[model samples]
Target: HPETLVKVKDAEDQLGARVGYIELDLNSGKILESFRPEERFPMMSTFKVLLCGAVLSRVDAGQEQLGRRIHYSQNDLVEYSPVTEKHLTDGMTVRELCSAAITMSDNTAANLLLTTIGGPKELTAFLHNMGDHVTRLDRWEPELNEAIPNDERDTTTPAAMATTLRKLLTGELLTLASRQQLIDWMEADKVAGPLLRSALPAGWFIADKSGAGERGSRGIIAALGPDGKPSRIVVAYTTGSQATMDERNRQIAEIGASLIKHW
Candidate 1:
């Protein structure tokens, strides 16, 4: 653990920022490295995964239907909503919104789902009901990217997130169909794969969500390993860095590179 702590500290110094990360074996629940794992960091778009998870939980309960269509107008569009913006006229199904949010990090898609499930407070309530008291969502997108220092709003600790992600994706929290859908969305992500995955071995596979904003804040939550079904989960975050987005991504990628041995 000390060795890992030292390496992480070196990375923080190199990037001129504070770093937090956690890596866990999905099967054994072994924590490979933990640095500020319990410290709160802005969750940004990474919350979309959990957002959709809650939606799917309702689906599993027969209370929600993914095939249901929802209508939205041009005024409903938000920044970074690549997928939803294109479908404004035709609207989109609940399943399509989930794909848009997770795969493309579509801001409007996330907000639509957030509102459908009641709102920010309700998502936080869902997190609590799922046995996660540390992760919280206090605001909606763009605003949630504030990433203010020491602020707990729209934040989740690496440890808490890693645990909850494992529970939702690999544990018994959701039915097989719902869980598979979530994984499919994650695997289909088009944003962070190139940013972080490029740092990994050629054959390694990762399903992840990434976020960026103030304080050079950037992070990723992923399930990854070489080929086959991923056997590990990684949650990494960096804050207070003045580095460019590309540089910040490099740091997170470097963190990913270091975990190759754990696989």
Candidate 2:
């Protein structure tokens, strides 16, 4: 365990910025490991996962359907959006937008989905009813795109995110069917692709989401390790880091490696 802890420390140092890392037992709802677990950081597109959760919660209540269509005229376009890149004239379905939001990190899809779920404060109610203390959805993707004041940006602590992940996946929030679809979209996340872009054996299966921005980057990965290994969820948040893209990627892989070794 000494060498493993060393690797984790090195990974945190390599992160080259303020970081928050937490690991939880999906079944036990217990914190297995954590570092700066309470640190609040910009969630970036990671907030989209909660958007999906809100939508699915509505779906389970018979208020909306995944097959529903959300029209996006050219006016809905935003920079860094894969939707605008694809040259769309008609629009996309709710499920398609959900997939694109997570799988492609499409800014357009995310903002549109925010409106679909009834805007910012609407989702915040769900977070609060769940007894959350530090996570919130305050503005739209366009706001983040416009470089809103840092204080006005969406934010959450790792512990809050980890708690929400547990509830969503554990059937305390969305129904089982809806929960699976949410995780399926997370599994389809193509941002950095596969295992939160970490090197956790090419075949490892994980359902999770990650995000990055001018401020920094972060990711949450939940895995049922191979060959009957223990299942766990891990969250890592980095802020104001200067690590290069390549170095960040490798350091994350090392972090995952050490985590898996501990199992």
Candidate 3:
């Protein structure tokens, strides 16, 4: 842990923040590097990944269909919903909703999908079914992004999320097609552009979902591929910082650089 501690402290000290992270082999579940892996941080839009996963589960069970179109009115619109807000007239398919929620971090799309799956409680129930007890969702978007210090609502530990990501993306918890769909959605994420994805080397690629919240909290959960090598799952979070978003992105980029060096 000292290796990870040493790698992250400089960033934390510079930003006056706390960083929690975990890196592990995607196939073997081996912990490669970490810092405060158990510490909780606001989940923000990252919860959409699992929200979509739960939706796909329903699809797998014949309870839902991706091609089904869903309509919503202006009342359904929420902040930062670039995709969903535009589709009020025509509506979007279940598949399109997943893409908007994961690839674009659309707040309204996430809420709609959340309703489709049940609610925050049901998503947490899905996590429990997947054997993850440490990750929980207590509210919906925007409100969930409050990121209040020491508040447990809408938060997840780096270790727990990484484990859950491994299960959803690599384990038998999901069918092969569903897993690939989720992975592809994350791979197309637009929100990660300035964070860990920016710091990666040219040959390396990352499929990730990034989140930002109030009180300067930020995080990214990713599946990293180092050119021709097996993939690795990484979860990193920062909280309790008063720094600018750019600075927070820098801290995560530094962590991304350290991860490349580690491998």
lDDT of 2 by residue, 45-153 (tens): 7788888888889889998899987776777788778764464766788888889888788888888888877788887887787778678878787464222234645
lDDT of predicted model 1: 0.87
| lDDT, candidate 1, 75-98, per-residue tens | 878778888888877889999999
Model 3 stretches astray by more than 4 angstroms: 1-4, 228-230
State the TM-score for model 1.
Answer: 0.95
| Per-residue lDDT value at 67 in model 1 | 96
Candidate 2, TM-score vs. the true structure? 0.89
lDDT of 3 at 132: 93
Candidate 3 residue-wise lDDT at 143:
94
* Candidate 2: residue 2 Cα off by (Å): 6.3
Residue pairs whose backbone atoms clash in candidate 3: none
lDDT of 2: 0.72
lDDT accuracy of residue 243 in candidate 1: 84
